[PDB]
């Protein structure tokens, strides 16, 4: 069934002709996150039409306004994606790489097939699982991606939402255990051509472990580097296909 999705993924660059960003009336009194448009474009181009794909975002404040958090790096990591959810390896050790100096971990960015105005249960669960004990101010940037279009929405999570993701250590598909949309609040995201970010990728290049579950260690202590990310169904994600044939 991957074969159809692989075919479909070739056209993802056409979805970038419709980029919608969730914006409310501006507030200078709270943070704004700035995503480089090139990062968004490439992230969509490597993604999948159905399966959730995810990465960490790293960045820092400009001098002009401390509250303007420029995203500088997307860190794509060993993961195993599903529809509606994704399993992500730990927050990467990247600190021994060049130019990582003075980067914050800003949070995570990911694809979804559903369109919402709030963080869903799998988002609140994975977001809590990643950030609850570590750095609670980290945002989610969710991307609805659908034929013709992508829609970007950024959220902070409440401590009620963090606690709910601690109560819900795992999600069976519709447990709905007093989940509330109000666990999440709108965060100011801007998409910028004025700045260009880059990618960090795992040192063995491969990040999509769909065909490789045995080598996915969700606890795993992976090494990383700067590099151009592979697409979801790249040959190197799919070595068995070339062993069968």
């Amino acid at each position: 069934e991957w074969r159809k999705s692989a075919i479909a993924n070739t056209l993802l660059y056409l979805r970038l002709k419709n980029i919608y960003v969730s914006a409310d009336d501006f507030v200078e009194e709270q943070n704004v996150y700035v995503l480089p448009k090139n990062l968004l474009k490439k992230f969509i181009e490597i993604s999948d039409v159905k399966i959730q794909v995810a990465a960490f975002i790293y960045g820092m404040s400009a001098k002009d306004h401390p509250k303007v958090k420029e995203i500088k790096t997307v860190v794509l990591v060993p993961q195993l994606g599903h529809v509606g959810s994704v399993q992500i390896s730990n927050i990467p050790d990247i600190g021994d790489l060049p130019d990582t100096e003075g980067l914050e971990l800003l949070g995570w960015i990911h694809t979804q097939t559903e369109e919402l105005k709030f963080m869903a249960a799998s988002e609140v669960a994975t977001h809590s699982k990643l950030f609850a004990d570590k750095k609670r101010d980290c945002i989610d940037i969710s991307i609805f991606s659908t034929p013709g279009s992508v829609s970007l929405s950024a959220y902070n999570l409440t401590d009620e939402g963090y606690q709910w993701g601690e109560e819900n250590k795992d999600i069976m598909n519709v447990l709905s255990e007093g989940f509330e949309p109000t666990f999440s609040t709108h965060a100011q995201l801007l998409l910028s051509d004025r700045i260009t970010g880059n990618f960090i990728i795992p040192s063995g290049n491969v990040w999509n472990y769909t065909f490789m579950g045995t080598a996915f260690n969700q606890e795993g202590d992976y090494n990383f580097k700067y590099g151009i990310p592979l697409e979801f169904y790249n040959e190197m994600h799919r070595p068995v296909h070339f062993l069968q044939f």
Binding site: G204, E235, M236, R238, F242, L243, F245
Partner: protein, 135 residues
């Protein structure tokens, strides 16, 4: 052909030979077009397809399959293993290669081949000459 499949029907099993004995030129022309136009992603891919046509193997296959003198058992074992080729390359000692194959005897020969496998160390720095021109 890139996978070296086996065939029964003489007509189809000569259609394939005609295809591969043309493939090299055609892929090299496609590669040239992309390199001239400046399209990095297809240029890198097309270089791998040119190599694949030359070598009768895919990028997911290891270059011990490109060393014409290599024993088959070693190739197959390494293609099963998760260890990257760029990782197996980093060995400087013959005994270590023997362990890496799980064959002492072949470690001696394959070490020679590894020290023959083409390898680069690269450093780069940039200098701004003008505001516009970078060396």
């Amino acid at each position: 052909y890139f996978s070296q499949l086996k065939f029964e029907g003489f007509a189809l099993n000569s259609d394939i030979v005609f295809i591969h004995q043309n493939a090299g030129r055609l892929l090299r022309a496609m590669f040239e077009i992309c390199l001239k136009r400046g399209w990095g992603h297809p240029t890198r891919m097309l270089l791998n397809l040119c190599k694949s046509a030359t070598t009768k193997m895919w990028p997911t296959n290891c270059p011990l399959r490109q060393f014409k003198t290599c024993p088959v058992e070693v190739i197959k074992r390494l293609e099963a293993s998760t260890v990257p080729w760029g990782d197996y390359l980093q060995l400087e000692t013959p005994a270590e290669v023997g362990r890496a194959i799980r064959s002492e005897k072949y470690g001696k020969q394959v070490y020679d081949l590894l020290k023959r496998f083409p390898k680069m160390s690269v450093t780069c720095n940039a200098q701004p000459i003008t505001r516009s021109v970078m060396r």
